[PDB]
Design a protein around this ligand. Structure first.
Ligand code: HEM
Length: 165
């Protein structure tokens, strides 16, 4: 097995969700704690995780949170501590999620699979790993989005790169 030296990931959650949050219906915004933003993608930076190159499995862990708000605080969605887990060319996007429904009632979903990953590219070597995957929304993710997206909806794709040591 190989440890992650430096990893980075790029994921916008969903472009149409960003535009909704910042648009004239939600009249909302987001705040970031330990996460950046560029190219309409949240920017994650991590130095932990491990990759079993022999078996092409791994987990790439990131700190940081995104906090979406809208509708005078009725919409309140937190996504934190994302993790890209892979086994072969499939995997899971895991995060800690707390979100509210349209009544403003919050649910702590805990640490949950937000989507299943299907990698279009996944490369692993002695010194690096990188990949890009489509993200298919999970049951818990659909509930966290207040049922506005159905399970299986395609979110933004996620990409990552990591040095390994
Ligand atoms: C008073 C509360 C709310 C109202 C009136 C409301 C209303 C709406 C409306 C009218 C749309 C369509 C927007 C468009 O197509 O441009 C929409 C989309 C959406 N809403 Fe809200 N909503 C509320 C709360 C919430 C909450 C609590 C969530 C939880 C995350 C949420 C998640 C979404 C999502 C995911 C979409 C789809 C955005 C997209 O097009 O990608 N909404 N909502």
């Amino acid at each position: 097995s190989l440890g992650v030296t430096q990893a980075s990931a790029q994921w916008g959650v969903k472009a149409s969700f960003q535009n909704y949050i910042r648009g004239s219906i939600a009249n909302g915004s987001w705040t970031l704690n330990g996460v950046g933003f560029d190219n309409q993608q949240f920017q994650f930076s991590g130095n932990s995780g491990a990759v079993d190159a022999e078996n092409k499995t791994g987990s790439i862990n990131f700190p940081g949170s995104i906090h979406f708000t809208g509708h005078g605080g009725i919409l309140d969605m937190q996504i934190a501590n994302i993790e890209i887990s892979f086994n072969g060319n499939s995997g899971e996007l895991i995060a800690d999620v707390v979100s509210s429904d349209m009544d403003g009632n919050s649910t702590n979903y805990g640490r949950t699979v937000v989507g299943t990953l299907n990698f279009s590219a996944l490369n692993v070597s002695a010194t690096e790993a990188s990949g890009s995957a489509s993200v298919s929304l999970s049951q818990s993710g659909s509930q966290a989005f207040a049922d506005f997206y159905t399970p299986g909806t395609q979110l933004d794709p996620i990409s990552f790169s990591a040095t390994l040591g």
